[PDB]
Scaffold this active site. Sequence first.
Site, short mmCIF file in Angstrom:
data_model
loop_
_atom_site.label_atom_id
_atom_site.label_comp_id
_atom_site.label_asym_id
_atom_site.label_seq_id
_atom_site.Cartn_x
_atom_site.Cartn_y
_atom_site.Cartn_z
N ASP A 79 11.14 12.28 -30.39
CA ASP A 79 10.80 13.62 -29.91
C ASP A 79 9.65 13.60 -28.91
O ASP A 79 8.70 14.37 -29.03
CB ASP A 79 10.45 14.53 -31.10
CG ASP A 79 10.43 16.01 -30.73
OD1 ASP A 79 10.86 16.38 -29.61
OD2 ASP A 79 9.98 16.82 -31.57
N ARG A 131 4.91 18.85 -24.94
CA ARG A 131 4.37 19.64 -26.04
C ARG A 131 3.88 18.73 -27.17
O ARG A 131 3.10 19.15 -28.02
CB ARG A 131 5.45 20.58 -26.60
CG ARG A 131 6.61 19.86 -27.26
CD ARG A 131 7.68 20.81 -27.81
NE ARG A 131 8.87 20.04 -28.17
CZ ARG A 131 9.87 19.79 -27.33
NH1 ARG A 131 9.85 20.26 -26.09
NH2 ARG A 131 10.88 19.02 -27.72
N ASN A 132 4.35 17.48 -27.18
CA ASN A 132 4.09 16.57 -28.29
C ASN A 132 3.13 15.44 -27.93
O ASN A 132 3.03 14.44 -28.64
CB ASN A 132 5.41 16.01 -28.82
CG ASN A 132 6.23 17.06 -29.56
OD1 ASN A 132 5.67 17.99 -30.13
ND2 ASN A 132 7.55 16.90 -29.56
N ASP A 191 2.96 13.94 -32.57
CA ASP A 191 4.16 14.43 -33.25
C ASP A 191 5.09 13.30 -33.69
O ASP A 191 6.29 13.30 -33.37
CB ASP A 191 4.93 15.42 -32.35
CG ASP A 191 5.96 16.24 -33.12
OD1 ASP A 191 6.02 16.12 -34.36
OD2 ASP A 191 6.72 17.00 -32.48
N1 4K0 Z 1 0.45 26.05 -29.01
C1 4K0 Z 1 0.57 24.98 -29.44
C2 4K0 Z 1 0.71 23.69 -29.96
C3 4K0 Z 1 -0.14 23.24 -31.01
C4 4K0 Z 1 -0.01 21.92 -31.54
C5 4K0 Z 1 0.98 21.01 -31.03
C6 4K0 Z 1 1.07 19.63 -31.61
C7 4K0 Z 1 1.98 18.63 -31.09
N2 4K0 Z 1 2.07 17.36 -31.62
C8 4K0 Z 1 1.22 17.14 -32.65
N3 4K0 Z 1 1.06 16.07 -33.35
N4 4K0 Z 1 0.15 16.28 -34.26
C9 4K0 Z 1 -0.30 17.49 -34.16
C10 4K0 Z 1 -1.38 18.10 -35.06
C11 4K0 Z 1 -2.77 17.91 -34.46
C12 4K0 Z 1 -3.53 16.75 -34.49
N5 4K0 Z 1 -4.74 16.99 -33.84
C13 4K0 Z 1 -4.75 18.29 -33.40
N6 4K0 Z 1 -5.76 18.91 -32.72
C14 4K0 Z 1 -5.55 20.23 -32.37
C15 4K0 Z 1 -4.35 20.94 -32.70
C16 4K0 Z 1 -3.31 20.25 -33.42
C17 4K0 Z 1 -3.55 18.89 -33.76
N7 4K0 Z 1 0.36 18.11 -33.13
N8 4K0 Z 1 0.26 19.32 -32.66
C18 4K0 Z 1 1.84 21.47 -29.97
C19 4K0 Z 1 1.71 22.80 -29.44
#
Ligand code: 4K0
Length: 289
Positions: free
Chosen positions: A149, A153-154, A167
């Site tokens: 994936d 966005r990831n 992600d």
């Molecule tokens: N709007 C929005 C949005 C928020 C979060 C993600 C995202 C995409 N991939 C990820 N893989 N792990 C995480 C969690 C995460 C780790 N560290 C973070 N710091 C801030 C916000 C979320 C996280 N994420 N979070 C994608 C889009």
Amino acid sequence: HIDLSALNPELVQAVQHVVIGPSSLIVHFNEVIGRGHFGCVYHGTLLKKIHCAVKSLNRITDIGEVSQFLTEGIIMKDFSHPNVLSLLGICLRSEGSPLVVLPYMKHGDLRNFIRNETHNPTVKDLIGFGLQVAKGMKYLASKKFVHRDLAARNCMLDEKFTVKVADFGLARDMYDKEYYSVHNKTGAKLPVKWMALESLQTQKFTTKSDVWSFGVLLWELMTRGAPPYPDVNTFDITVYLLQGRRLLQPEYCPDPLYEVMLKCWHPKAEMRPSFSELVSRISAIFSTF
Ligand SMILES: N#Cc1ccc(-c2cnc3nnc(Cc4c[nH]c5ncccc45)n3n2)cc1
């Protein structure tokens, strides 16, 4: 209440390498910083206080599903690379599914970062971000880990503007539901507009289908976060690709970078570049800037 005794003992041992005690973790459940299908992400503080991101798995209530998810994702603890999101640990407690504790990414996800009009990232900035992702994927590929994936966005950006491929493993979820569709052979939600032709046909994912996705991500970067194939229905993505059609060159994408994109979308998986080759090619393009 998730009982460790029920889980496979080998899984328990792996988990115990990264366990975080409840008294060591403070979670602000009123501060959501991401939303997933398995649970939301919250502002957390890990104890000497460290700002972190706490990903909930509470929507997963079946012990069999929790076990499978942990099994598939725990390998995350064995990875270490500047361009790959790390795992801080796992908080097991008395009520609720395990909490996945992750490094905080101060600049959020890459797609929203480049869409933000006040940021206005330059062509150089964007190719730079793409190169960082390629290096992260080169590492994952060297470990024979298939992401499945990869998309803008990831990928996340930390306080130093280092891009982390994210992600995956214990951090896996769908963080923007708009771009996952059940119109595919599995009948489950998948990122069909990022998927390689052969994955849509055979339901199989490889490092070479990750390369396909990386090409789409490069396209996202150069369009500053435009959605791919906005005019192609999810019903039609397979035949669209079968006809040889592909994403068009972004206005501000250098010709040589578009050539790289096209190489990533070659219909024969084996003809597509390795991530090692992508790092080399993109590095040269970046250096001309
Ligand atoms: N709007 C929005 C949005 C928020 C979060 C993600 C995202 C995409 N991939 C990820 N893989 N792990 C995480 C969690 C995460 C780790 N560290 C973070 N710091 C801030 C916000 C979320 C996280 N994420 N979070 C994608 C889009």
